[PDB]
């Protein structure tokens, strides 16, 4: 083993690897979403940009794993990056919709390891979710929820007034 | 079709896609290489924070892809990016090796795009080929190049020493 | 022929000349759609500044066309500025198509011209084209293709608070 | 009892006085390195201040322990600071080789102490060593082992050449 390591369980490592992949599938899902808000029979261009910013935020947190991993003296082990699930997004409201799961499926991922940690009795890792991870996580799910009553009080879907007020000030 | 589409054929919108997926799977690698170089039992931080700005540059080339494609008219469809051909990278004359062989890679498939759009008139995706990727790959084709002949010049892979030096007078 | 000229057909500098007049014409054009938004009945400044602005690019492309003219030793040769087509421009949606086919028209006798010049191996020309027009041509066509998206959004043509609304979050 | 303590175990108190004389212990142990370093027949200036630094960073460790300990209302007891292992340590690598060990002693003693912590339901003391002392020590290991790494690449113990060149680049 690594010089370095531990207290440092190999299902840990190994979940630390799945958790980097889901990371970077939850970027690559929001650049996605971008995309389909600046298509020109879209034009939300507000909405856009927050994607854009989170599939920013996701790969930073990517990032901030693979460095564990090593500091730790485990090993990154990449994976394919799956495509996203859709091709198009609907709208404002069906795009919250999937960004509230993304954001719940990933913090259950968290959490779960986060068990696994307290299983092999790993306080480092348990800090380390506890202190970068699972705060921002509550954080943007609870704003993205926000967001999702705003738009079905705006109308949404039928409500094309309503989706334009949301883009103009909303998106902040 | 779009409402903005003008002189934009739907092979080379196709082309744009494909190239967006090798952007990011460039992108990918590059991550891979900062990964292995921050191990512990290689520890070469300055060639790993090269390889972390490569990788970031590539996914910003992927970002404006997908800016160019909806300017047009075109429709971004992702596909899974896969991961890097390699787990370990060896040595940093290994690394930069692969490197090379991956600019070119990206470089052919660039010129193979322009060709296309060439063939069919379309002179606005040359001169957005041309003023937004076509140097930035001759330059870093070049500048990997160098490095290699330094790398052999100190005595990689054998010479560790040679190996040390590198990564404290190159990588800037 | 001038002591200056090489490289230079016949062909081009009259297709010059022939674009200077079309820019000219698209400069007058946004200028009645200023003039229309700015009447006491209609009443819908942002709009109206919108296009004045554009009515100043379009002049400045043509002054620019006027000295590609003189530096190559072609003669400027001008014609009547032709009148808009309409007198009276509707409201925001229709005026923002009129647009849209204008800048479209405008970009085909661009692309028409570098035609010429790539027939006529007159690479000056070509870069002129490339890095002085069309990529602007894009961003505007795109632009307010997204304008127009925005405005079938907020019911135009019949929902007048819609259109209030896009001149106060849009035009920006 | 002090009439400031609530939820903390004699088992625990007892356990803070031991930790607070192994960092003791540390700080003691790296003064040594830092003198051998600085003898004029060693002469690595650079590596003697790393080991010097590294010193005063453990007295600080055993200060916040005397803190944390009259906080709680527990009470320090003392006892003597064994004298390092060593009087003399060899070359860098060895001495790299020995405070890694060092570092992982120190850190299996804090990993105790948390579990400890956690078997006695104390969660304030578990978030004392995870945000003031865990993170810390994963780091240090980290950089050490890095450090160990490149001695080896360099050809210690028999490259003095080698070992020049990392007092000269490596210890920043
Ligand atoms: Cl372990
Ligand atoms: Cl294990
Ligand atoms: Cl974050
Ligand atoms: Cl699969
Ligand atoms: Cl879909
Ligand atoms: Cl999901
Ligand atoms: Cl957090
Ligand atoms: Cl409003
Ligand atoms: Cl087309
Ligand atoms: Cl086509
Ligand atoms: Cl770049
Ligand atoms: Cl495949
Ligand atoms: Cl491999
Ligand atoms: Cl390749
Ligand atoms: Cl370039
Ligand atoms: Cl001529
Ligand atoms: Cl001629
Ligand atoms: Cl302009
Ligand atoms: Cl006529
Ligand atoms: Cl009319
Ligand atoms: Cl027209
Ligand atoms: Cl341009
Ligand atoms: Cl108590
Ligand atoms: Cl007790
Ligand atoms: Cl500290
Ligand atoms: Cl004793
Ligand atoms: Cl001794
Ligand atoms: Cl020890
Ligand atoms: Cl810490
Ligand atoms: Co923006
Ligand atoms: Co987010
Ligand atoms: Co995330
Ligand atoms: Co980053
Ligand atoms: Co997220
Ligand atoms: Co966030
Ligand atoms: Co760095
Ligand atoms: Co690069
Ligand atoms: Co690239
Ligand atoms: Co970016
Ligand atoms: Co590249
Ligand atoms: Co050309
Ligand atoms: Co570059
Ligand atoms: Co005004
Ligand atoms: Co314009
Ligand atoms: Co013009
Ligand atoms: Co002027
Ligand atoms: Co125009
Ligand atoms: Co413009
Ligand atoms: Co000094
Ligand atoms: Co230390
Ligand atoms: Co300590
Ligand atoms: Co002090
Ligand atoms: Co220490
Ligand atoms: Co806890
Ligand atoms: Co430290
Ligand atoms: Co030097
Ligand atoms: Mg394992
Ligand atoms: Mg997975
Ligand atoms: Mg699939
Ligand atoms: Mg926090
Ligand atoms: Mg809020
Ligand atoms: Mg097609
Ligand atoms: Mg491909
Ligand atoms: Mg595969
Ligand atoms: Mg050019
Ligand atoms: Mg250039
Ligand atoms: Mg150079
Ligand atoms: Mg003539
Ligand atoms: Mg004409
Ligand atoms: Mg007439
Ligand atoms: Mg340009
Ligand atoms: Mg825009
Ligand atoms: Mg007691
Ligand atoms: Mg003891
Ligand atoms: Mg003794
Ligand atoms: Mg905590
Ligand atoms: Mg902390
Ligand atoms: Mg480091």
């Given at each position: 083993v690594s010089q370095?390591?531990?207290?440092?369980?190999?299902?840990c490592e190994a979940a630390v690897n799945r958790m980097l992949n889901l990371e970077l599938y939850a970027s690559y899902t929001y650049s996605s979403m971008y995309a389909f808000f600046d298509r020109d029979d879209v034009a939300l261009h507000n909405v856009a940009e927050f994607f854009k910013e989170h599939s920013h935020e996701e790969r930073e947190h990517a990032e901030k794993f693979m460095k564990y991993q090593n500091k730790?003296?485990?090993?990154?082990?990449?994976?394919?990056?799956?495509?996203?699930?859709?091709?198009?997004?609907?709208?404002?409201?069906?795009?919250?919709?999937a960004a509230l799961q993304l954001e719940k499926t990933v913090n259950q991922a968290l959490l779960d390891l986060h068990?696994?940690?307290?299983?092999?009795?790993?306080?480092?890792?348990?800090?380390?979710?506890e202190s970068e991870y699972l705060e921002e996580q509550v954080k943007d799910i609870k704003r993205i929820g926000d967001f999702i009553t705003n738009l079905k009080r705006l109308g949404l879907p039928e409500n094309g007034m309503g989706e334009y007020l949301f883009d103009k000030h909303s998106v902040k």
């Amino acid at each position: 083993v690594s010089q370095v390591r531990q207290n440092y369980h190999s299902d840990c490592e190994a979940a630390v690897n799945r958790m980097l992949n889901l990371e970077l599938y939850a970027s690559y899902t929001y650049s996605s979403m971008y995309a389909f808000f600046d298509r020109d029979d879209v034009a939300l261009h507000n909405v856009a940009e927050f994607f854009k910013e989170h599939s920013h935020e996701e790969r930073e947190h990517a990032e901030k794993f693979m460095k564990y991993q090593n500091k730790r003296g485990g090993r990154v082990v990449l994976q394919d990056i799956k495509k996203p699930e859709r091709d198009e997004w609907g709208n404002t409201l069906e795009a919250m919709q999937a960004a509230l799961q993304l954001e719940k499926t990933v913090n259950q991922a968290l959490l779960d390891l986060h068990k696994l940690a307290t299983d092999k009795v790993d306080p480092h890792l348990c800090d380390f979710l506890e202190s970068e991870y699972l705060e921002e996580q509550v954080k943007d799910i609870k704003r993205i929820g926000d967001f999702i009553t705003n738009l079905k009080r705006l109308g949404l879907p039928e409500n094309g007034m309503g989706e334009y007020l949301f883009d103009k000030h909303s998106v902040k």
